[PDB]
């Protein structure tokens, strides 16, 4: 009732915030990530390297969020930790996020999302592209919210399902507020 | 020579890492790692640290692979994933376990060695986030640096790239020698005014 109506509202706000961030990224000359470092790499190699890195970066951040929300409830067994992480980084989950954000086949969608995450993070380290790091953080947060909401509806933990859904929804609502306010401050510059 | 620097490097890595680890063991926060749970079927906190340490090692290793290989366009992408796999695989983590004498080298299983290394990494990182135990974060970084150095030295000697074998090995050896100075220096700082 309250959670399923909020979940629908969350998907709209996530789309709006992520679309707004990404629309300003496409104004940046650095946006074509595959054509950088041309004296040292190629388009195909950049795509594999960014996907290589994005894979591990997503994996680490997803692991951190699983711990963040599940360790509070001792009723939850360790199977759900690995279960949730697997559910969060699998290509089907990433492809759903691909579709929700209208980024553009099963396997390609996940690879593209991973390459985008990794490319954005690496760009923010090698250039000034703090907007690109903001997008990667918000994209992973939306990936975790999307995954965990689905996962805990299919695999409700003992007694605390609605409370941990509320924790994740409250957390993600605050992140969306933070990402929105960061975007306006960066764009009101 | 590079191999003279290598054998000296393994002496210094053992001493720095053992020196940091000895200070961590004096800290009451070390108890929370529950490394005893490596022998137990009741090993929830140990598995959770291992769960996270696995991912943290993967990301840091990925970052180090990109760091050294991307300046060499001679090196194809297959060596990026080849080096990462060689670095995080259970066999490499076991060799580090044995090099540091973390536990018994015999009545302590092969996969168990890699799991303990991963759990120790994860627990240290989580302790630094939750308890501001910066010495534990220093150790996690130093341990992964040694893991990468040890792995990269063996990998590129076994799989020499085109033209640049010696140059990339010099790159990694010089870097790790600088890290060892940094970790030694950071430790001396910490132990005189924590
Ligand atoms: Mn990958
Ligand atoms: Mn992939």
From TrEMBL, chain B:
Keywords: Metal-binding. One of its GO terms (molecular function) is metal ion binding. Coiled coil: none annotated. It comes from the Eukaryota. Mn(2+) binds at residues 50, 54, 115, 118. One of its GO terms (biological process) is RNA processing. This is Uncharacterized protein. It comes from Entamoeba histolytica (strain ATCC 30459 / HM-1:IMSS / ABRM). The chain holds residues 2 to 195 of 256 of the full protein.
